[PDB]
């Protein structure tokens, strides 16, 4: 048993980058990596679809507001097609390192996350920041809904 995680979002947001970083000196395009989350092992199968579904990860760039709105629409779309079996959905604002070209604030993303029933987190593939945390939250979010 593995946890299938799909990566969604607009082009160039850093979907391939995050998946690539997640794996990951081990031994299991799809990326497989076993990780210990809260003392409990869990195998993840990261799916970079654009290159079933236990969870969906919607990635957007904080330096591109267009990808942010596109994320909201995808979140709405997923909702209106998957019920119940409401698999956990995580909103990810990638490219947090680019603090000059940022068009979306941390609060703005966290706001739309909570109102649209999403898990929020900002990551930086370039800096390997919150990348781990993201996939640890995914596993932690998948469980929360047996
Ligand atoms: N500065 C910075 N650049 C990043 C970050 N994440 C990704 N990039 C850059 O953004 C570009 C797109 O990365 P990529 O992973 O291909 O995004 P993608 O979502 O796979 N794009 P596509 O839809 O074309 O497949 C690359 O040049 C990559 O180096 C980040 O956190 N910071
Ligand atoms: Ca691996
Ligand atoms: Mg790609």
Question: Short description, anyone?
Answer:
The chain has helices at residues 15-22, 65-79, 106-115, 131-143; strands at 3-9, 30-37, 40-47, 55-61, 89-94, 119-122. By secondary structure, it is of the alpha/beta class.
Fold and architecture overview:
With 146 residues, this protein is an alpha/beta fold. The protein has a single domain (1-146), classed as 3-Layer(aba) Sandwich (Rossmann fold). It has 4 helices and 6 strands. The two termini are 14 Å apart.
Helix-strand layout with pairing:
Blueprint: E1 3-9, H1 15-22, E2 30-37, E3 40-47, E4 55-61, H2 65-79, E5 89-94, H3 106-115, E6 119-122, H4 131-143
Residues 11-17, 50, 94-95, 97-98, 124-126 line the site of phosphoaminophosphonic acid-guanylate ester.
PDB class: signaling protein
Keywords: G-domain, G-protein, Cav2 beta, signaling protein
Assembly: monomeric
Give a list of the ligands: phosphoaminophosphonic acid-guanylate ester, calcium ion, magnesium ion
What is the strand tally? 6
CATH superfamily: P-loop containing nucleotide triphosphate hydrolases
Fraction in helix: 25-40%
Helix count from the secondary structure assignment: 4
């Amino acid at each position: 048993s593995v946890y299938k995680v799909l990566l969604l979002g607009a082009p160039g947001v850093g979907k391939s980058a995050l998946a690539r970083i997640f794996g990951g000196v081990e031994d299991g395009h799809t990326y497989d990596r076993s990780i210990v989350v809260d003392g409990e092992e869990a195998s993840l199968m990261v799916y970079d679809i654009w290159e079933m579904g236990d969870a969906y990860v919607i990635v957007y760039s904080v330096t591109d507001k267009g990808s942010f709105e596109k994320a909201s629409e995808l979140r709405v779309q997923l909702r209106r097609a998957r019920q119940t079996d409401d698999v956990p959905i995580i909103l990810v604002g990638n490219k947090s390192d680019l603090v000059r070209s940022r068009e979306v604030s941390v609060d703005e993303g966290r706001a739309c996350a909570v109102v649209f029933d999403c898990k929020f987190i900002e990551t930086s593939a370039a800096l390997h920041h919150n990348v781990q945390a993201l996939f640890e939250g995914v596993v932690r979010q998948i469980r929360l809904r047996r």
